[PDB]
Structure formats: structure tokens, C-alpha cells
Amino acid sequence: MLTYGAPFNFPRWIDEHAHLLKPPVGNRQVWQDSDFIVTVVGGPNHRTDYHDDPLEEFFYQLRGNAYLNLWVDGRRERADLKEGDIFLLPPHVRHSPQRPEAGSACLVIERQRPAGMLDGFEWYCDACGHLVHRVEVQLKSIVTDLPPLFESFYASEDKRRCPHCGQVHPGRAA
Amino acid sequence: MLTYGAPFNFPRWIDEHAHLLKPPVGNRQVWQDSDFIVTVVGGPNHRTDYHDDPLEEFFYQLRGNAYLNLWVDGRRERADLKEGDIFLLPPHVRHSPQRPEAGSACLVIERQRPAGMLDGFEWYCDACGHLVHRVEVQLKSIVTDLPPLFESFYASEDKRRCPHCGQVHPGRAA
Numbered sequence: 001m002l003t004y005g006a007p008f009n010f011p012r013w014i015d016e017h018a019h020l021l022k023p024p025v026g027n028r029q030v031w032q033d034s035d036f037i038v039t040v041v042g043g044p045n046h047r048t049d050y051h052d053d054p055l056e057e058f059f060y061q062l063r064g065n066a067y068l069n070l071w072v073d074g075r076r077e078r079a080d081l082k083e084g085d086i087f088l089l090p091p092h093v094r095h096s097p098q099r100p101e102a103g104s105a106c107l108v109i110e111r112q113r114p115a116g117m118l119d120g121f122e123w124y125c126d127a128c129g130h131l132v133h134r135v136e137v138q139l140k141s142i143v144t145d146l147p148p149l150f151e152s153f154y155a156s157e158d159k160r161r162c163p164h165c166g167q168v169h170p171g172r173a174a
Numbered sequence: 175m176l177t178y179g180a181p182f183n184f185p186r187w188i189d190e191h192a193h194l195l196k197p198p199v200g201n202r203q204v205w206q207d208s209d210f211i212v213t214v215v216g217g218p219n220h221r222t223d224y225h226d227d228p229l230e231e232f233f234y235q236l237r238g239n240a241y242l243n244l245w246v247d248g249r250r251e252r253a254d255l256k257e258g259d260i261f262l263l264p265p266h267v268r269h270s271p272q273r274p275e276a277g278s279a280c281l282v283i284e285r286q287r288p289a290g291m292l293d294g295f296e297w298y299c300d301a302c303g304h305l306v307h308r309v310e311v312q313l314k315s316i317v318t319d320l321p322p323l324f325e326s327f328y329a330s331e332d333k334r335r336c337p338h339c340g341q342v343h344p345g346r347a348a
């Protein structure tokens with residue numbers, strides 16, 4: 001049987017769940033308990049973290065503009081997602097999605113991570129660019145597991161303290 | 175590094191490769207050698223086969239209309255893909271994509287199949303609806319491996335002969 005239901009108009013679905021896309025992630029999963037994690041992400045979001053996904057991530061910026069802050073070698077990069085753009089991210093490339101515009105919508109498709117394959121969430125220093133803190137987690141829900149992790153980073157100056165130059169990361173204000 | 179390149183406008187990409195989408199599949203893969211198999215499928219295609227994918231398949235009918243002939247229990251069903259519709263197909267649900275309109279375009283995303291996980295391609299009888307022929311293959315390319323398989327079915331009345339009522343499947347004319 002069609003465990004995930006019949007086909008349905010996507011633009012309409014987005015219009016109807018627009019009000020449900022809220023910070024910090026701006027996340028909303030389309031189907032539950034599926035191998036393909038299909039989500040729509042809107043704005044304005046609030047991400048100061050760099051995600052380290054063990055698998056690839058597909059992007060299709062349907063509405064509005066957004067961009068991904070990245071690290072390509074050891075340098076911070078910016079990959080813009082102009083409305084209409086699609087993009088496939090190689091596994092493990094560090095990325096921090098910046099979605100500043102309201103009414104924005106990007107289709108993001110990922111995969112359920114196999115047991116033992118963990119996701120990483122990182123923060124780097126503004127000053128020396130050194131790694132400040134990293135949390136590895138067996139990701140069970142890209143919609144609910146995230147906010148709690150960030151909150152623990154923001155609630156601790158010890159986690160935010162750069163082990164290289166001692167600078168304390170701005171927390172939820174960077 | 176961005177092994178798959180930078181983001182790019184999708185509508186434009188489709189406009190530029192429109193002429194490359196041809197029968198029987200109407201297939202075109204966006205990125206090569208990736209875990210996520212991202213393809214755009216246009217029309218008019220020519221499919222008389224039912225695909226048995228061991229993994230899920232994501233659909234997003236971007237341009238035009240199409241439909242999937244299915245089997246939901248033992249009955250032939252039809253799941254329409256109206257322009258704008260998205261759909262996630264559970265693994266193994268038998269489906270035969272019918273894409274009759276030219277200039278049509280549907281985003282189809284699947285996964286690279288792990289060794290040992292085979293794909294099935296089937297044909298059923300018009301008369302008794304019984305299974306007429308099934309080929310299992312370690313799918314290495316949903317863009318090039320398909321046509322050769324179908325051609326062998328069409329070139330053999332023995333493969334097309336229903337083991338239940340003896341009716342010979344119409345081949346590439348059903």
C-alpha cells in the first residue's frame with residue numbers, strides 16, 4: 001500500500017504550513033518514518049552552527065533566497081541558494097544554513113542515518129577560526145533534536161570558550 | 175570540496191537539457207556518482223513495465239502532468255502526478271510511469287542500491303493479470319541499464335507468454 005499517502009500539490013501544502021516554519025531551524029518534515037527525510041525549511045532561521053552530515057543533502061530553493069556558510073578547505077565559504085537553485089552537498093562538508101527571509105521555502109532531502117553513523121554539530125571561533133565545540137549525535141529527528149543541542153551550547157561559556165585563543169563565542173548572537 | 179559543484183538554477187537547466195529527455199525512459203541524471211540519484215524525467219515516454227524498487231522514490235512533477243500505473247493489493251491502480259504534486263513511493267510498490275506529454279518534467283530522486291539489493295522489472299498479463307515475466311538486476315544506472323532490459327522482453331514471445339493463460343504480451347505496443 002501507499003504507506004505515505006497519495007500525491008498532493010506541494011505549493012499548496014507549503015502555503016498551508018507556512019505559519020509552522022519557525023526558528024531556530026525553520027523545519028517541517030513532509031512524511032513521517034520514511035528512509036528519505038523530506039523537509040521544507042523557511043525563514044527567518046537562526047543558525048550559528050555548522051552541520052556535519054555523514055550523508056548527502058539535496059537542496060531546492062523553491063521560494064526566496066538563502067545561503068550556506070561553508071568551510072571548503074580551512075576557509076569559510078558562502079554558497080548562495082537563489083530561488084530556483086538546486087544543490088547536492090557532499091557528505092561531511094560543514095555548512096551553516098542562513099535563511100533570512102520570511103515566506104522563504106527550500107526543499108531539503110536527506111537520509112535516515114544508519115546506527116553508528118553520527119551527525120556532528122560544530123561552532124568555530126570568530127577570532128582564530130579554530131574549532132570551539134563539537135557535539136556528535138545519532139540523529140533521530142532533524143526537526144526536534146536540533147534546538148536542544150544548540151541551547152546547551154548557548155547556555156555554557158565553557159563550551160563556547162575557544163581552546164586556542166580563549167575567545168568566548170557570542171552564543172545565540174553570533 | 176563541493177564534489178558536485180555549486181548551486182545552479184534548475185528551471186534553466188531543464189530548459190537546456192529538454193531536448194535530451196527521450197524515450198523509452200525520458201531520463202536524465204543531474205549529478206554523477208552520488209548516493210542520491212537525482213533525475214529529471216520528461217515525455218512522451220514508453221513504459222509497459224512495472225518497476226520494483228527496493229528503496230523509496232521521491233517525485234516532484236515540476237512541469238506538465240503524468241501518472242503512475244500501480245498495483246495496490248492485486249488490483250491495478252492509478253496515482254496521478256498533476257503538475258505541482260510531490261509523492262513518496264514506499265519501497266517495492268510496483269509502478270509503471272506514464273509520461274505522455276512533451277515538455278513535461280518530473281524530479282525523481284532515488285538512492286544508490288547497496289550490493290545484494292536488486293531491482294525488479296515486471297510485466298503482467300492484460301487478460302489474467304498474472305505475472306508474465308520478471309527480471310532482477312543490480313541496478314547501476316537508472317539511465318542506461320533500463321532500455322536494454324525492456325528490449326530483451328520485447329524481442330521474445332517466450333518471455334511475453336503468460337504462464338497462466340498463455341496470452342502473449344503485446345510487447346512494445348501495450
Ligand SMILES: Nc1c(C(=O)O)ccc(Cl)c1O
Nearest residue numbers: 025041051053057097108142
Ligand atoms: N540543511 C539543513 C537545514 C537547512 O537547510 O536549513 C536545516 C536542518 C538540517 Cl538538519 C539541515 O541539514
Ligand SMILES: Nc1c(C(=O)O)ccc(Cl)c1O
Nearest residue numbers: 199215225227231271282316
Ligand atoms: N520512477 C522512475 C522513472 C519515472 O518516474 O519516469 C523513470 C525511471 C526510473 Cl528507474 C524510475 O524509478
Ligand SMILES: [Fe+3]
Nearest residue numbers: 051053057095
Ligand atoms: Fe545539514
Ligand SMILES: [Fe+3]
Nearest residue numbers: 125128162165
Ligand atoms: Fe579562537
Ligand SMILES: [Fe+3]
Nearest residue numbers: 225227231269
Ligand atoms: Fe521506479
Ligand SMILES: [Fe+3]
Nearest residue numbers: 299302336339
Ligand atoms: Fe494471462
